[PDB]
Write a protein that binds this ligand. Structure first.
Ligand code: HEM
Length: 154
């Protein structure tokens, strides 16, 4: 797939607001993911023990990881489709070190959109949301193709 420049512009406009508070958004997103789909929490040996939202909010380690997650994602979105090199080490660790099924990538995609919609309704209308969804689909399908090449696909 190919996004048009207009769709990229809606994606990076919203993303510019996210970057005003990278730590805050990464924590909201990860927490939303773990509440909505608790099974994903089990893949993180580091966070496995957190039992409540309050424990998650309080974890400095979790907020650090969220900053790490959104920074890697930001650098990919800013490539506007040209993200081959950024993608490979990411797919390799998640496929063969962390053992992450493809399905969980959709789950975090869902969380991202929920959070942007709650925090940026003015900059996250129907059109901007369709653009963000297209960008994350594009991303997921490229991750899925790399999984396959790496011998995982699952
Ligand atoms: C937008 C999607 C995501 C991005 C950009 C992302 C990025 C990263 C980065 C940059 C790291 C650290 C270096 C590495 O191991 O490659 C990491 C580690 C990790 N990721 Fe992801 N991640 C994403 C989605 C996921 C998903 C869907 C899961 C699990 C449901 C996941 C599980 C993990 C685990 C288990 C670690 C290691 C945590 C630790 O340090 O103990 N990631 N992620």
């Amino acid at each position: 797939m190919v996004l048009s420049e207009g769709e990229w512009q809606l994606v990076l406009h919203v993303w510019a607001k996210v970057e005003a508070d990278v730590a805050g958004h990464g924590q909201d997103i990860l927490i939303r993911l773990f509440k909505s789909h608790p099974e994903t929490l089990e893949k993180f040996d580091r966070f496995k023990h957190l039992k409540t939202e309050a424990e998650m909010k309080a974890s400095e380690d979790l907020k650090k990881h969220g900053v790490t997650v959104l920074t890697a994602l930001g650098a990919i979105l800013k490539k506007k489709g040209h993200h081959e090199a950024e993608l490979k080490p990411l797919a390799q660790s998640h496929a063969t070190k962390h053992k992450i099924p493809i399905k969980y990538w959709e789950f975090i995609s869902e969380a991202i959109i929920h959070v942007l919609h709650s925090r940026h309704p003015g900059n996250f209308g129907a059109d901007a949301q369709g653009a963000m969804n297209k960008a994350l689909e594009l991303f997921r399908k490229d991750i899925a193709a790399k999984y396959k090449e790496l011998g995982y696909q699952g």
